[PDB]
UniProtKB/Swiss-Prot annotation:
TPR repeats lie at residues 170-203, 204-237, 305-338, 340-373, 443-476. Coiled coil: none annotated. It comes from Pseudomonas aeruginosa (strain ATCC 15692 / DSM 22644 / CIP 104116 / JCM 14847 / LMG 12228 / 1C / PRS 101 / PAO1). This is TPR repeat-containing protein PA4667. It holds the Pfam family TPR_16. The keyword Repeat applies. It comes from the Bacteria. Keywords: Repeat, TPR repeat.
Length: 523
């Protein structure tokens, strides 16, 4: 281990902080200006000058002052921080490629190991803090979080077992319980949670975790009593009541969940989410009328689109597609802010219930209404590709990649279709390279990279890229691609063995079945 070897982790930390700063700037730019007090005073002043028809000339003069202009201060701070981070990153990439006595300069190695942004430095700082203040509950909780996220949960649990504060403090106890539940030994977590209520009776999260652990076992009857006790001690907590309704709804005890949801309706808190969950429960109860009447009264927000999708799905289950289209059009006319998302809902529902022609017609209608929506024509591309229509699929995909030269996924999609179907191999290499440079973390882009490398002739690079893409996430398509690429280079047993796992007797593995027949056909 040397200093140059340690600098990469520092660069990774700088990358994380740069990403966070840039995303922070992005969310700042969209956000409206905070009320503050100057705009509040101007609001009361406008409320005053509104009484007389004569213009409040002094109010207009003051409200248009040069100091009343939004300079976007925090956004500029975030941008400048991201810029200096990028500058330092560039500097230390320039320092990395240099050669020298990287070793035996122990002064800088200590600073490289004390960096809180590196995982090893995080752990070193946590160890130094536990040395300074031992048995600190929050420090143990943070170190256990670090160890569990690092991919070593059992070591974190063993660290928790050695500390006595893990039995007393609420957050370490909660983390130890959810860790023990993942080790398939949930019963060991039962007594500790009880002891927590002995130490923290008024703490609602501890009792909620106790109730969830009761639900985990078959002994759910006491969990209903725990719900009743929580409601008895804190009948005003609306978020706690919503969480109790959610856990009761997970344990398919529909009666108490419906009771809690109607109680939330009476208290006028989380009304749209409450009605959405009532609609889901009624859909489970096969009560189509109640589910529809509850989905219709879901207000706009983070639950309007799921309610619309569930309504469309129930309508398609009933077979009255005309009423489904009419309700979706009426909802589009009611709230046109994300009407494009309503069209996406319609397309998804029609594609998931075997109405290919109606899905294509709805997408055509949506594009006629919004010809510039970049999601709508991409959905048209996927529908045309499912319809074996490569022409429309190429036209709109070229359209979207020309209008947005920096749309990775669409840029990726066409490229993959270039490698898999046609023989325009030169464009596909550049297309997949650009998609990989835009977002290397995307595993479908890595799959496309292995596929174009395999069809281009480079067998080793294709195998490595497909191996990486398969390591990130298990997919049947990537599995078949890796199997075929490995089979072509040789090592038949390895390709045969890789196929054994991801077959899994899956109806989704219908495409995978054809890869085996194509290659075992030569036998």
């Amino acid at each position: 281990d040397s200093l140059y070897s340690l600098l990469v982790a520092e660069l990774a930390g700088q990358r994380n902080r740069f990403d966070i700063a840039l995303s922070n700037y992005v969310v700042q730019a969209q956000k409206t200006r905070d009320p503050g007090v100057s705009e509040r005073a101007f609001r009361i002043a406008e409320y005053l000058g509104a009484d007389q028809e004569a213009l409040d000339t002094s109010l207009l003069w003051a409200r248009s002052a040069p100091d009343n202009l939004d300079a976007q201060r925090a956004a500029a701070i975030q941008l400048a921080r991201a810029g200096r981070y990028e500058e330092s990153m560039v500097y230390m990439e320039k320092v990395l490629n240099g050669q020298g006595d990287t070793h035996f300069d122990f002064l800088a190695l200590s600073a490289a190991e004390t960096d809180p942004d590196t995982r090893a430095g995080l752990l070193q700082s946590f160890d130094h803090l536990l040395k300074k203040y031992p048995n600190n509950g929050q420090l143990l909780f943070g170190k256990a979080l670090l160890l569990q996220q690092d991919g070593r949960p059992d070591e974190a649990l063993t660290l928790l077992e050695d500390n006595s504060a893990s039995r007393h403090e609420v957050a370490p106890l909660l983390l130890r319980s959810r860790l023990l539940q993942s080790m398939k030994r949930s019963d060991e977590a039962l007594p500790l949670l009880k002891a927590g209520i002995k130490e923290h009776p008024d703490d609602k999260r501890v009792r909620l975790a106790y109730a969830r652990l009761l639900v985990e076992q078959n002994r759910l009857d006491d969990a209903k009593a725990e719900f009743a006790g929580l409601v008895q001690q804190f009948p005003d907590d609306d978020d706690l009541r919503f969480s109790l309704a959610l856990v009761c709804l997970e344990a398919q005890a529909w009666d108490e969940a419906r009771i809690y949801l109607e109680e939330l309706v009476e208290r006028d808190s989380h009304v749209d989410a409450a009605h959405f969950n009532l609609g889901r429960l009624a859909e489970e109860q096969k009560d189509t009328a109640r589910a529809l009447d509850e989905y219709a009264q879901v207000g706009p927000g983070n639950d309007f689109l799921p309610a619309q999708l569930r309504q469309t799905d129930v309508l398609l289950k009933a077979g009255r597609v005309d009423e489904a289209a009419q309700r979706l059009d009426k909802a589009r006319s009611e709230q046109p802010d994300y009407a494009i998302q309503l069209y996406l809902i319609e397309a998804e529902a029609l594609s998931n219930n075997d109405q290919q022609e109606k899905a294509w017609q709805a997408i055509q209608e949506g594009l006629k209404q919004y010809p510039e929506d970049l999601n709508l024509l991409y959905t048209r591309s996927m529908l045309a590709e499912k319809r074996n229509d490569l022409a429309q699929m190429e036209k709109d995909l070229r359209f979207v990649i020309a209008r947005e030269p920096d749309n990775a996924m669409a840029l990726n999609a066409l490229g993959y279709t270039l490698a898999d179907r046609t023989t325009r191999y030169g464009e596909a290499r550049e297309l997949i390279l650009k998609a990989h440079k835009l977002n290397p973390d995307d595993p479908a882009i890595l799959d496309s990279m292995g596929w174009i490398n395999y069809r281009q002739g480079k067998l080793a690079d294709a195998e490595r890229y497909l191996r990486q893409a398969l390591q990130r996430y298990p997919d049947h398509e990537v599995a078949a691609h890796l199997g075929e690429v490995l089979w072509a280079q040789g090592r038949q047993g390895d390709a045969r063995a890789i196929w054994r796992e991801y077959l899994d007797k899956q109806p989704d593995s219908d495409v995978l079945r054809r890869t085996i027949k194509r290659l075992t056909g030569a036998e």
